[PDB]
Amino acid sequence: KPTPQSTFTGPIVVDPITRIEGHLRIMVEVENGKVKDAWSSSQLFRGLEIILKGRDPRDAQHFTQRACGVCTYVHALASSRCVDDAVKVSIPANARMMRNLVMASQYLHDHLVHFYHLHALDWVDVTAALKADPNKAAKLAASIAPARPGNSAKALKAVQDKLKAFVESGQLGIFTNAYFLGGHKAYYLPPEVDLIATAHYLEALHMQVKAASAMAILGGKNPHTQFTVVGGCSNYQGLTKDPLANYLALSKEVCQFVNECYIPDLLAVAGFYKDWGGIGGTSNYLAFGEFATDDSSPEKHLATSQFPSGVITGRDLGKVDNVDLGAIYEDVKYSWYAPGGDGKHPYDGVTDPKYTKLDDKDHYSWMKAPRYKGKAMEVGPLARTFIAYAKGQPDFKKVVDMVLGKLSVPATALHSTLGRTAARGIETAIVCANMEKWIKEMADSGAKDNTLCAKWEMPEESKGVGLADAPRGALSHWIRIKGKKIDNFQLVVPSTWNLGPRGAQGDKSPVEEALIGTPIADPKRPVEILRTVHAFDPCIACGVH
Amino acid sequence: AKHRPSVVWLHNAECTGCTEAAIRTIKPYIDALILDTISLDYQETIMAAAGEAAEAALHQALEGKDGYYLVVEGGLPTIDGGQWGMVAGHPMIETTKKAAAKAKGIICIGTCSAYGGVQKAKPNPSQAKGVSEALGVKTINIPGCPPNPINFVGAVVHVLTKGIPDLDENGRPKLFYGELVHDNCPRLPHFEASEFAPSFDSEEAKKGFCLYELGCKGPVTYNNCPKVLFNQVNWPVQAGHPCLGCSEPDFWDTMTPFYEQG
Numbered sequence A: 001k002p003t004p005q006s007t008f009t010g011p012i013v014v015d016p017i018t019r020i021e022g023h024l025r026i027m028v029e030v031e032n033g034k035v036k037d038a039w040s041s042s043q044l045f046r047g048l049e050i051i052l053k054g055r056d057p058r059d060a061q062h063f064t065q066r067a068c069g070v071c072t073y074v075h076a077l078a079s080s081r082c083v084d085d086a087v088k089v090s091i092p093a094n095a096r097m098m099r100n101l102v103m104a105s106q107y108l109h110d111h112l113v114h115f116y117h118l119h120a121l122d123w124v125d126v127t128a129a130l131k132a133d134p135n136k137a138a139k140l141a142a143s144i145a146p147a148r149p150g151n152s153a154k155a156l157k158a159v160q161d162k163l164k165a166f167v168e169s170g171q172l173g174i175f176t177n178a179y180f181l182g183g184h185k186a187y188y189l190p191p192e193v194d195l196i197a198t199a200h201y202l203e204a205l206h207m208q209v210k211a212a213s214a215m216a217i218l219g220g221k222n223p224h225t226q227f228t229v230v231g232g233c234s235n236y237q238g239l240t241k242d243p244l245a246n247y248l249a250l251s252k253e254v255c256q257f258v259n260e261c262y263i264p265d266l267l268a269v270a271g272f273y274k275d276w277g278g279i280g281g282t283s284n285y286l287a288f289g290e291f292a293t294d295d296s297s298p299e300k301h302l303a304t305s306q307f308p309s310g311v312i313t314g315r316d317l318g319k320v321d322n323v324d325l326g327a328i329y330e331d332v333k334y335s336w337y338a339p340g341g342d343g344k345h346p347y348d349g350v351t352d353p354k355y356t357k358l359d360d361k362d363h364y365s366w367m368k369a370p371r372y373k374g375k376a377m378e379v380g381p382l383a384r385t386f387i388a389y390a391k392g393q394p395d396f397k398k399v400v401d402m403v404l405g406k407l408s409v410p411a412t413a414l415h416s417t418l419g420r421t422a423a424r425g426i427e428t429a430i431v432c433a434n435m436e437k438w439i440k441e442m443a444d445s446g447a448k449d450n451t452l453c454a455k456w457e458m459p460e461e462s463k464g465v466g467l468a469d470a471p472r473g474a475l476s477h478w479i480r481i482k483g484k485k486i487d488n489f490q491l492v493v494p495s496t497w498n499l500g501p502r503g504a505q506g507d508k509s510p511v512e513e514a515l516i517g518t519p520i521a522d523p524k525r526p527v528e529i530l531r532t533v534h535a536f537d538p539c540i541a542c543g544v545h
Numbered sequence B: 001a002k003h004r005p006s007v008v009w010l011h012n013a014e015c016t017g018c019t020e021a022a023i024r025t026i027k028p029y030i031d032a033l034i035l036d037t038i039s040l041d042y043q044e045t046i047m048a049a050a051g052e053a054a055e056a057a058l059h060q061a062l063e064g065k066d067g068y069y070l071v072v073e074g075g076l077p078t079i080d081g082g083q084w085g086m087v088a089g090h091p092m093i094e095t096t097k098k099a100a101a102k103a104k105g106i107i108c109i110g111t112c113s114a115y116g117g118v119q120k121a122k123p124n125p126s127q128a129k130g131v132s133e134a135l136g137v138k139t140i141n142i143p144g145c146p147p148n149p150i151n152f153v154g155a156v157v158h159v160l161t162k163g164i165p166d167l168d169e170n171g172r173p174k175l176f177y178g179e180l181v182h183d184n185c186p187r188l189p190h191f192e193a194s195e196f197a198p199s200f201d202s203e204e205a206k207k208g209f210c211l212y213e214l215g216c217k218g219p220v221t222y223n224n225c226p227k228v229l230f231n232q233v234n235w236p237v238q239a240g241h242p243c244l245g246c247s248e249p250d251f252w253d254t255m256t257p258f259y260e261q262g
């Protein structure tokens, strides 16, 4: 029937929000079973911007990468771009290619882990998988997905047996007190679909190991790569034949799993949760672009990004504006910072921590509130997808239409939690479709010329910005150099955009806005809050740093 | 079914890089470990329950009849009574303190839990401390930023099947941290011959010369990196980059500047 909804009126708090990176507290007001107001409260401060002051600009990338071990690498990249810009060095073509491939590797690993190990348990009842008949499940998989041994009845039965023994032991481990135990109205999947997804969940645990190995061939190690330097990269071995053959091999495997399991699972889930095409929409989208053919400057990045940069307002796909890096600022009015810190451009950023109390609706987050000409901006896969689709980018046009057609929904249905979830898979598919081309580009370039790092000089005084679109969205690092040292170093991170608190106008952030209208089938077990929050792929260490 | 030992895993001031490191294990894989070997009964990053239900899962685990082992990821922020780092409205220091009080053993995964880590680097705005530093409980330290999964899983298995492994001064298992990075480095012949790369763009760098001039901290860092590799494929020096000394206490301040020697 209709989307299940209680008549519950009152507050709900979820803390901890699990299956994210970091420490999030969500508070909502509920009226007659629907969320009417929301607060996104980040619960940990570390202070990397404070820590960086006075240090060597060459050290920045090593501190900032520790902003996040889930989106590992991306902060080392943004810092390197930032410092490269500040000293005005243009990196060699091979360094641009190596840096962008490691980013492609990161998207693949990050997105697969998110769908399966962080997000899926909001949609898949694992214990209902035990009810499944493995033959029916094998027949369902056969018809919804490419044929594969791991989808056989024999395979699904093994998964079921393993799960049965685990559950029968009485130690449910990570499934203890799950919102789905004993059944739950907001969980719609047939037991067979639960089984298919559960088997793939287990498969994805092994596959993420391979995705990280691929990344490590070029990045030195994962987590926390160690191959970027001012002026380019250090990894000459990464330009050579045998490691690049291994890299392609592992990548092809990961992408096979993306095409065989991830996308089909995503499409099957979206099919049953069609109603979630009308829950959790926002209206503004921003991207700095990624995978640029010219990374010699911030300018050239925004212009030449293969996943294009852009700004969309009020859902208007007919009007994609250029990113005005001058119009970006951060507010602290509803944040745990010293008041009078509002409206600061990141070149002029101030990080002056000041705590009040838990659930102080005046000051309720360790995140700042980034705003673009006053407007809250959603960043991430859905942002990139809308901007690329509106701009007519051929891969996105073709993958989006495939999705919208398989689901029979208008493109407007994408402005929602379902769409946010679908866009993450969409772009994973597109990154996969480009891996071979990108790898061949660098293999050839690296065999004709192995130049990987340019010469450069530390200025007395400069500034620079490094832009990236990380898996969660638009990332920027901003540096002021004075006396050859870090005078100011500011991070503005995708989860700061998405999950930060209200701005100086009292205007809700994207996640707070997305949560308005959320139906709550069972206030005791509010899975619907999790579904929307997780769809934004929150990274709290990223957001606060 | 044979009872599997209960493991509670706490997240404090951290980047979740140590959790991510852990799940790159291949001997065994993460699924085999949590289905066959341990009962992982609280892990914020992957557990199904959230909010109150998750909190209840923790408290259930802490009250288990067969007891539990405690794994700690992250440092402890102590400023303002521990309020700059909170889970379920409780300071992380208070929760970790409770959990450490009845643990069979405490394993600190990562440089952050072991020694304080990145948030403790000067000027340490949150007054972050290592687990033993802040509480005075003795800990088994598995440092690195992040440690190799071989070192963490190996330590875990040893503790469950053999006893406490032999530890060095810094509470690290000698099994994994008994040797200098440098002593096992394939570039050691270049070091011995005074063949150093002067820059990353240099011919010396392209030829794989020693990285000591470029700040390599291998000579003062205890870890097994060149011996075991990461992700079965690589390590930083093989990727042409100096060691940062990331398994050493307070490396953020003792090993910086990273591209210089002391």
Ligand code: SF4
Pocket: A066, A069, B013, B014, B015, B016, B017, B018, B073, B074, B109, B110, B111, B112, B113, B117, B118, B144, B145, B146, B147
């Ligand atoms: S030791 Fe390093 S990887 Fe581990 S939580 Fe701390 S900063 Fe992150």
Ligand code: SF4
Pocket: B181, B182, B183, B185, B186, B187, B188, B189, B191, B209, B210, B211, B212, B216, B217, B218, B219, B237, B242, B243
């Ligand atoms: S590269 Fe580093 S670890 Fe290797 S020999 Fe040189 S100083 Fe030692």
Ligand code: FCO
Pocket: A068, A071, A074, A075, A470, A471, A472, A473, A475, A493, A494, A495, A496, A538, A539, A542, A543
């Ligand atoms: N992706 C990612 Fe992490 C966040 N938010 C960064 O940058």
Ligand code: F3S
Pocket: B144, B145, B181, B221, B223, B225, B235, B236, B237, B242, B243, B244, B245, B246, B247
């Ligand atoms: S930086 Fe850390 S990972 Fe090993 S090579 Fe050096 S100890």
Ligand SMILES: [Mg+2]
Pocket: A049, A368, A490, A491, A492, A493, A545
């Ligand atoms: Mg910031």
Ligand code: NI
Pocket: A021, A067, A068, A069, A070, A071, A072, A539, A541, A542
């Ligand atoms: Ni992150």
